């Protein structure tokens, strides 16, 4: 469907947030999942899928546990040849009722027929203020491509290069990213909820419905204001 | 295996100024609380300053505030502590303490004081204040 853009007052604000913006900046380094061509090897709970994918670094299989907001969609991925890609994290990643057991939300595609022989360049335009200054694109192999997917990418890239969530030297109060494909728009928060905590596992949680979007289609936009 | 080791201890004069160093082995100083404690013969451990490697977020105890600065240097894999306007009631062995690193997560500040959080000290060194 469509989604209202947001009220005033609705974004989180970082000033109301008093806990480690360490917590939320990790989700969006260097570190995150991406496999390419793999297929489910287990399953803990109905709602998830796990895969055996290798480091590179250590040499080894690390399994990551993928999580869907319902069984359908576990169903659906089961026993098909996937790409995964998604910001992983484990401080509540639970195996059973520890860098070799990480857990994530959403962030799976069906691997044959959604390969482009050709990339698509998808530009993203970052407003502060009002103000489209910034704009870069991000460019995918992907035909259908998870929102989470997009969203990594484009956040990564703000960390890297306009600050975004250092605790310190942010120049940022509100934030969320619109993903726009024809005439209908859904956006994140990309702002910690205020208080003193933050929870890796429920922020990461809104990717678990794994909406997907067209690479041809889709168009980015990062509204972010100071402070 | 851990190791931490203290250096640039010594025996000063009220109002002296000293600068401790950490050198750790068996593992990097990122991603992390990295802690200095001290130590009166007959006191409990207690926290003066931590430092979160990751970002370089400062905690500091009510004794070092305005005096004490603690600083990390990622590439000699070591932390620092300096220490102005030393005074008598300073005089303590100083200890570097290594925090957990966990995974994409880090401890909150409130508990980066708390000793029981340390799994792994160095020997310590001696800092003594003439009054």
């Known amino acids: 469907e469509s989604q209202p853009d947001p009220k005033p007052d609705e974004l989180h604000k970082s000033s109301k947030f008093t806990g480690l913006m360490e917590n939320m900046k990790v989700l969006y380094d260097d570190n995150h999942v991406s496999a390419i061509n793999v297929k489910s090897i287990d399953q803990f709970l109905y709602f998830d899928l796990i895969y055996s994918i290798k480091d590179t670094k250590l040499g080894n299989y690390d399994n990551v546990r993928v999580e869907f907001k319902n069984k359908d969609l576990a169903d659906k991925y089961k026993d098909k040849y996937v790409d995964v890609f998604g910001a992983n994290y484990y401080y509540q990643c639970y195996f059973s009722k520890d860098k070799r057991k990480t857990c994530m939300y959403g962030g799976v595609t069906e691997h044959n027929g959604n390969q482009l022989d050709k990339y698509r360049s998808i530009t993203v335009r970052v407003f502060e203020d009002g103000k489209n200054l910034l704009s870069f694109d991000v460019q995918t192999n992907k035909k259908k491509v998870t929102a989470q997917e997009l969203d990594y990418l484009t956040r990564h890239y703000l960390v890297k290069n306009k600050k975004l969530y250092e605790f310190n030297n942010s120049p940022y109060e509100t934030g969320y990213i619109k993903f726009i494909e024809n005439e209908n728009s859904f956006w994140y928060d990309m702002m910690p909820a205020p208080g003193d905590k933050f929870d890796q596992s429920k922020y990461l949680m809104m990717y678990n419905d794994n909406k997907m979007v067209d690479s041809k289609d889709v168009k980015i936009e990062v509204y972010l204001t100071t402070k | 295996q851990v190791q931490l080791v203290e250096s640039g201890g010594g025996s000063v004069q009220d109002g002296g100024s000293l600068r401790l160093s950490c050198a750790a082995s068996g593992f990097t100083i990122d991603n992390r609380w990295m802690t200095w404690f001290r130590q009166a013969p007959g006191k409990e451990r207690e926290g003066v300053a931590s430092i979160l490697t990751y970002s370089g977020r400062t905690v500091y105890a009510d004794s070092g505030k305005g005096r004490f600065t603690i600083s990390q240097a990622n590439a000699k894999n070591s932390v620092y502590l300096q220490m102005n306007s030393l005074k008598p009631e300073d005089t303590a062995t100083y200890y570097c303490?290594?925090?957990?690193?966990?995974?994409?997560?880090?401890?909150?500040?409130?508990?980066?004081?708390?000793?029981?959080?340390?799994?792994?000290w160095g020997q310590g060194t001696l800092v003594t204040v003439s009054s």
């Open positions: 303490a290594a925090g957990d690193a966990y995974h994409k997560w880090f401890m909150p500040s409130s508990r980066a004081l708390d000793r029981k959080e340390y799994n792994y």
